[PDB]
Design a protein around this nucleic acid. Structure first.
Ligand SMILES: [K+]
Ligand SMILES: [Mg+2]
Ligand SMILES: [Mg+2]
Ligand SMILES: [Mg+2]
Ligand SMILES: [Mg+2]
Ligand SMILES: [Mg+2]
Ligand SMILES: [Mg+2]
Ligand SMILES: [Mg+2]
Ligand SMILES: [Mg+2]
Lengths: 214, 205, 60, 212
RNA sequence: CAGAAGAAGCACCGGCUAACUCCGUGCCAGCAGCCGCGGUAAUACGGAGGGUGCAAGCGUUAAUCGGAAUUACUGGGCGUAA
């Protein structure tokens, strides 16, 4: 199972407001949170932009916890949200109504609102692959990498053997060994190392969303 | 171009009241004048001759609220002007409109006077002047603006001025809130505490 | 010429373009110049909070 | 004297040895094998810099295609001796590092773990944080506490760059008078010891610290 | 007319030279105009607190004269220091 992740393609400013009566007690939480794309590998970044008097200080940590939990849950296919920056630019509250849970729900609502306007996209893990094989089978190796949607960055010759460096999706990478043995006639070896998370092809991504949906 | 930090700290460093407060309450109640500012202020280090000269020059600057560049230019003018350089230097600082307003009692402190001068509440010879550095000549009349007369601060300042000793070279009238710079202040009129020679020496250094 | 690289740590490599200023380094014979930190390829010292202007460090 | 190698280097040595050996298992072409033998031999030599007779003996066993996993273990154990253990700070010093956290408690760390520890990290459940102590490029001990997610998910760990059970770790910036603070974090292995063993490059951990 | 509202930084604190402690490091990392400082109680390195000096600037580098009576006209020397 390939560990796909989600990120927001477009930055958006959204307001999440929750107002409801629970157990005979009104609960009102409002949070206005800006979600922006983050640099690859930067990870989740949260900034508190509340000067004060717009959100109760006690509820602010709860809001952050809600966002964190929602990212873990995922907004599209349920893949963990990554490379997103969250900033609580504005908020509103009622002393009696406001509660930690209410604000946490409001944060979740904000992230749902963000998901609508942030253009979230699934990210697939990309593995850098170094393959050593005889030059005779090198053309076959090139074809296999192309078939797996991998791109060969460069080719390096070491003696008789030829070294190929390419970046291939992990999903595509599975079963490479068997193919390599067939292509090289068991005369080639390869090593793959994870490099980065890259956006899934839209057609594939759509299918993945459908699969996770059902 | 102005010092916006704590006033009493400056007084504590000098170890003397620099008249940076109105004087409604004693400086001692407000601060520990004896002790120098900071962690190591309580200990008294031996002061070098350079240090003694510096601290004298710093005192005068802090009293009149003049930065070094402008104070240097005053010294050069005092040296250029005929007579005692040190006495000339003190006369120039006294000649400043800022000082005159405070001495006339329109302002409680020289900083208060500065705000009055700055905010166009002061007229010299019936013309509005907003320069603190403006030099008031003999026979000039400094009058508060008619609009500014209504301000409460001016009235309170005049009462505090009554407690202070009245400058001989300045004639002032309450209610009218106008004053005349009759003559340039003599060295005798100014406080003997200030050592002009140290400042002259420091600049000769 | 030989130029001393001031501060703790540097990113200088061969072929790096740097700006040098006057300043001998006693104890290093023949070093009559200092490289200006924070100028051209040379970068400011990381996590420096005092004399930042001397080591090309922006206000934290 | 015996060569001294960093823990991350030893992990790389282990990885290359396993990689080198796997070639013997799979690759049927002696020519291809030979190329990798030389590459790995160089890599091991490079890490050691100087190879003693004991390393040479191990290298000879490594070069042979008849190398066995039991032999590998023995070779690794010898290489482990060359490795230098992480220096634990004095308990007083630790508290000085974590001035903000009074009466910070440290669990007992295994000597082997210390030997293979590029960094030392311990998680407190009550804290809900992971406390990490490490020596930087300057070799000053650096201690940091950041919130660790209770939820664990399978994903590539930032520190080691290996897919494992990871929990999001967030480091909070110093709170201003307003009460505004910025938290920056990335998913990392929940177990520091496991991550340490996985980690082969000290720089990767440093990069994660830079991100914080 | 409205409202303190919209407006403070830079260098330095061993001696020379105005301004001192703590912590970290332990001839390392570094500093440095000069004399020097750093090998486990560093006012000298790095950070912090406090302080000093200047201030929309402050430092650094380069450059000239000064201090330099150290080319001596003003205004020096030559027994042993040239
Ligand atoms: K002569
Ligand atoms: Mg100016
Ligand atoms: Mg001193
Ligand atoms: Mg010490
Ligand atoms: Mg010069
Ligand atoms: Mg001369
Ligand atoms: Mg002579
Ligand atoms: Mg002789
Ligand atoms: Mg002779």
């Amino acid at each position: 199972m390939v560990s796909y992740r989600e990120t927001f393609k477009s930055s958006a400013q959204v307001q999440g407001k929750f107002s409801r009566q629970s157990g005979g007690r009104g609960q009102y939480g409002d949070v206005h949170i800006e979600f922006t794309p983050n640099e690859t590998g930067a990870g989740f970044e949260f900034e508190n932009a509340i000067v004060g008097g717009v959100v109760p200080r006690e509820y602010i940590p709860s809001v952050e916890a809600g966002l964190k939990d929602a990212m873990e849950n995922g907004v599209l296919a349920g893949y963990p949200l990554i490379d997103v920056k969250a900033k609580l630019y504005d908020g509103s509250y009622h002393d009696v109504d406001s509660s930690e849970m209410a604000f946490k729900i409001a944060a979740s609502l904000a992230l749902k609102e963000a998901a609508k306007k942030c253009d979230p996209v699934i990210l697939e893990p990309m593995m850098k692959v170094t393959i050593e094989m005889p030059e005779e089978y090198m053309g076959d190796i090139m074809g296999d990498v192309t078939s797996r949607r991998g791109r060969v960055d460069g080719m390096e010759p070491r003696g008789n053997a030829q070294v190929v460096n390419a970046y291939v999706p992990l999903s595509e990478m599975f079963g490479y060994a068997t193919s390599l043995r067939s292509n090289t006639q068991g005369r080639g070896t390869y090593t793959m190392y994870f490099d980065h998370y890259a956006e899934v092809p839209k057609s594939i991504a759509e299918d993945i969303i459908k699969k996770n949906k059902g | 171009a102005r010092y916006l930090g704590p006033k009493l700290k400056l007084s504590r460093r000098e170890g003397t009241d620099l008249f940076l407060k109105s004087g409604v309450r004693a400086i001692d109640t407000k601060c520990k004048i004896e002790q120098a500012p900071g962690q190591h202020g309580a200990r008294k280090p031996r002061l070098s001759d350079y240090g003694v000269q510096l601290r004298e020059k710093q005192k005068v600057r802090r009293i009149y609220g003049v930065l070094e560049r402008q104070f240097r230019n005053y010294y050069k003018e005092a040296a250029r002007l005929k007579g005692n350089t040190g006495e000339n230097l003190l006369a120039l600082l006294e000649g400043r409109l800022d000082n005159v307003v405070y001495r006339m009692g329109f302002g409680a402190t020289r900083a208060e006077a500065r705000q009055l001068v700055s905010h166009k509440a002061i007229m010299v010879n019936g013309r509005v002047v907003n320069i603190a550095s403006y030099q008031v000549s003999p026979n000039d009349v400094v009058s508060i603006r008619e609009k500014a007369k209504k301000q409460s601060r001016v009235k309170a300042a005049l009462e505090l001025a009554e407690q202070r000793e009245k400058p001989t070279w300045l004639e002032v009238d309450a209610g009218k809130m106008e004053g005349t710079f009759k003559r340039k202040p003599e060295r005798s009129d100014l406080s003997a505490d200030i050592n002009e020679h140290l400042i002259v020496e420091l600049y000769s250094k | 010429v030989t130029s001393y690289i001031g501060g703790e740590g540097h990113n200088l490599q061969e072929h790096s373009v740097i700006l040098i200023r006057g300043g001998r380094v006693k104890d290093l014979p023949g070093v009559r110049y200092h490289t200006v930190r924070g100028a051209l390829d040379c970068s400011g010292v990381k996590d420096r909070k005092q004399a930042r202007s001397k080591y090309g460090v922006k206000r934290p | 004297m015996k060569t001294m190698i960093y823990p991350h280097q030893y992990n790389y040595i282990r990885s290359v040895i396993l990689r080198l050996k796997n070639v013997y298992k799979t690759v049927n072409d002696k020519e291809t094998v030979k190329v990798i033998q030389s590459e790995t031999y160089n890599d091991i030599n490079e890490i050691f810099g100087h190879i003693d007779d004991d390393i040479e003996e191990s290298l000879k066993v490594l070069m042979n295609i008849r190398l066995s996993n039991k032999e590998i273990e023995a070779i690794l154990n010898k290489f482990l001796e060359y490795v230098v253990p992480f220096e634990l700070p004095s308990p007083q010093k630790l508290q000085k590092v974590f001035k903000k956290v009074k009466k910070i408690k440290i669990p007992q760390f295994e000597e082997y773990d210390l030997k293979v520890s590029s960094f030392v990290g311990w998680n407190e459940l009550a804290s809900n944080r992971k406390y990490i102590i490490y020596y930087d490029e300057k070799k000053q001990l650096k201690g940091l506490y950041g919130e660790i997610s209770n939820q664990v998910v399978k994903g590539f760990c930032t520190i080691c760059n290996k897919e494992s059970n990871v929990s999001l770790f967030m480091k909070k910036s110093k709170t201003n008078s307003d009460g505004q603070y910025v938290k920056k974090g990335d998913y990392i292995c929940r177990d520091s010891i496991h991550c340490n063993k996985q980690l082969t490059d000290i720089n990767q951990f440093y990069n994660f610290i830079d991100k914080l």
